[PDB]
Scaffold this active site. Structure first.
Site, PDB file in Angstrom:
ATOM      1  N   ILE A  26      88.584  12.185  38.589  1.00  0.00           N
ATOM      2  CA  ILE A  26      87.273  12.373  39.204  1.00  0.00           C
ATOM      3  C   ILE A  26      86.650  13.608  38.583  1.00  0.00           C
ATOM      4  CG2 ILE A  26      86.003  12.657  41.331  1.00  0.00           C
ATOM      5  CD1 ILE A  26      88.351  11.451  42.836  1.00  0.00           C
ATOM      6  N   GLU A  27      85.705  13.361  37.684  1.00  0.00           N
ATOM      7  CA  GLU A  27      85.041  14.421  36.958  1.00  0.00           C
ATOM      8  C   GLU A  27      83.910  15.073  37.723  1.00  0.00           C
ATOM      9  OE1 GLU A  27      86.232  12.705  32.558  1.00  0.00           O
ATOM     10  OE2 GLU A  27      84.188  12.325  33.283  1.00  0.00           O
TER      11      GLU A  27
ATOM     12  N   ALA B 268      80.099  17.531  36.843  1.00  0.00           N
ATOM     13  CA  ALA B 268      79.176  18.053  35.832  1.00  0.00           C
ATOM     14  C   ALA B 268      79.784  19.297  35.206  1.00  0.00           C
ATOM     15  CB  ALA B 268      77.827  18.380  36.460  1.00  0.00           C
ATOM     16  N   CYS B 269      80.387  20.129  36.041  1.00  0.00           N
ATOM     17  CA  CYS B 269      81.058  21.323  35.548  1.00  0.00           C
ATOM     18  C   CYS B 269      82.495  20.858  35.272  1.00  0.00           C
ATOM     19  CB  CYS B 269      81.033  22.410  36.616  1.00  0.00           C
ATOM     20  SG  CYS B 269      81.846  23.926  36.140  1.00  0.00           S
ATOM     21  N   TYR B 270      82.719  20.383  34.049  1.00  0.00           N
ATOM     22  CA  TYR B 270      84.014  19.856  33.614  1.00  0.00           C
ATOM     23  C   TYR B 270      85.260  20.418  34.313  1.00  0.00           C
ATOM     24  CZ  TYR B 270      81.646  17.282  29.834  1.00  0.00           C
ATOM     25  OH  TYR B 270      80.857  16.409  29.117  1.00  0.00           O
TER      26      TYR B 270
ATOM     27  N   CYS C  90      92.518  15.158  37.781  1.00  0.00           N
ATOM     28  CA  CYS C  90      93.238  14.070  37.139  1.00  0.00           C
ATOM     29  C   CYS C  90      93.681  12.986  38.099  1.00  0.00           C
ATOM     30  CB  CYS C  90      94.449  14.624  36.396  1.00  0.00           C
ATOM     31  SG  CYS C  90      94.002  15.841  35.165  1.00  0.00           S
TER      32      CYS C  90
ATOM     33  N   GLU D 216      96.780  11.617  38.360  1.00  0.00           N
ATOM     34  CA  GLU D 216      98.073  11.946  38.950  1.00  0.00           C
ATOM     35  C   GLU D 216      97.889  12.886  40.144  1.00  0.00           C
ATOM     36  OE1 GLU D 216      96.905  11.979  35.775  1.00  0.00           O
ATOM     37  OE2 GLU D 216      98.456  12.910  34.529  1.00  0.00           O
TER      38      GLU D 216
END
Ligand SMILES: O=C1NCC=CCN1[C@@H]1O[C@H](CO)[C@@H](O)[C@H]1O
Ligand SMILES: O=C1NCC=CCN1[C@@H]1O[C@H](CO)[C@@H](O)[C@H]1O
Ligand SMILES: O=C1NCC=CCN1[C@@H]1O[C@H](CO)[C@@H](O)[C@H]1O
Ligand SMILES: O=C1NCC=CCN1[C@@H]1O[C@H](CO)[C@@H](O)[C@H]1O
Ligand SMILES: [Zn+2]
Ligand SMILES: [Zn+2]
Ligand SMILES: [Zn+2]
Ligand SMILES: [Zn+2]
Lengths: 130, 130, 130, 130
Positions: free
Chosen positions: B43-44, B46-48, B53, B55
């Protein structure tokens, strides 16, 4: 026997550690191929997750200076019965910039065990998989 | 041959992946000793850095349900020339709850390599050092 | 869909908190549009930086389950003096899925204060900035 | 100590940005009370969650060097439409070291908007809450 130089530098770095929550100070000294040394310590935050490790602070300081070719890194802590080993996250940042360089996991007295980023992060995920 | 069950579950999980920035979907299916299976995906944000992840999403979902005894985990991605391996961070969260359990790093076709948390995170930093 | 539900549900969520390091339990109850609630708790790691907050645990659980809407979220802590407010990181993950919805910052007292995601993180960085 | 210095210094900092994934360079210039400036940039990782922002890179550099004061910080990006605002996580790390100081959100134009750490993260979680 210049490993000695790094070790002292990582213990020096450990002094600037901002760890009011864990009281577990950690220092690291990163050595570039150019020969320059970058120091880093852990920097915690009230919201634990937002903290940062000593290794990460050194790598990030060096990368922000244009140094991305590392020859070795030394980690120091106030722990006695265990060598200070980098956490999975730090091993992943190291990997971002190299796979075959030595990581010096020391003890307060000066003793240490050494392993490369590859040995520490076997079958690693990396840039190439993207 | 129940590994098969996990693999499909991790590919199912990969479908709920929210990765608009990397377009690199990732799924994981965690198996507890009780026999229950927990799914997770990346689940990404905008602010990387604020992303998470697959897992980690599964482990965190399971731990929030009271399951902290894991028997195995399977990771799935849309990558072809590489098995999908957990990153250093994820290997550190796994470690928090176990050292001898299998991690199934799969390929889209069903093939995979298996390694324990210990093998993936040798000379690991852990709870005991605190 | 209702405040009371969020107050007790976020309170139960706090019970599964895995926080042996901070000893600071936190619970979260995310209400989706559909009316389904997702509980979450803080889940720490030996390496502080790798822990995760109750709100993110809850949100991630939801998203991995297909829900990216959210009508509200309530936070809870063992803190009797003051309502637990989400950390900037959580506000940032919250924003990734909307900026108007409410965040119920509570007290074990049942009393609370409410602020929108936008009010909690003003002039925020978001997906639009790519 | 002066705006112009922060505008150009945060602009140079952006040059060292290691962002092969987002291709979104960001620079930071942290001005300490003493008058010393610390530059920082975003440093990404193959595993998105492990990257780090320009502001944190800058702050961490400073702290590791003994400075925990800070008179201001300016952010810069290649974004010509709108000023780069810090992500919630950065605001949270900023808050750990003060809540009043200014954050200069800029444009390559040299134009900017300014908001205090407190205005950026209202009703924030902090060290006092332990
Ligand atoms: O810098 C670290 N490096 C080495 C080993 C473990 C993780 N830490 C730090 O130790 C503290 C306990 O997790 C916290 O400040 C981490 O950043
Ligand atoms: O979930 C992951 N697990 C396996 C391997 C790498 C890291 N990722 C995700 O892949 C994307 C690229 O970094 C990002 O969403 C990570 O969370
Ligand atoms: O879940 C949280 N949510 C709300 C408020 C603060 C941050 N935390 C957690 O509180 C602990 C103290 O930083 C740590 O476990 C965080 O994950
Ligand atoms: O340094 C940043 N500061 C300010 C604004 C956004 C977040 N970023 C960076 O922008 C990229 C997009 O998320 C990623 O490399 C972050 O570290
Ligand atoms: Zn680390
Ligand atoms: Zn990972
Ligand atoms: Zn949080
Ligand atoms: Zn940031």
């Amino acid at each position: 026997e210049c490993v000695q130089q790094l070790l002292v530098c990582s213990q020096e770095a450990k002094q600037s550690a901002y760890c009011p929550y864990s009281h577990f100070p950690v220092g690291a000294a990163l050595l570039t191929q150019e020969g320059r040394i970058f120091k880093g310590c852990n920097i915690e935050n009230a919201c634990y997750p937002l903290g940062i490790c000593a290794e990460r602070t050194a790598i990030q300081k060096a990368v922000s200076e244009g140094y991305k070719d590392f020859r070795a890194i030394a980690i120091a802590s106030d722990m006695q019965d265990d060598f200070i080993s980098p956490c999975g996250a730090c091993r992943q940042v190291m990997r971002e910039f190299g796979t075959n360089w030595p990581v010096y996991m020391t003890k307060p007295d000066g003793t240490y065990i050494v392993m490369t980023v590859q040995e520490l992060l076997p079958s690693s995920f990396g840039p190439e998989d993207l």
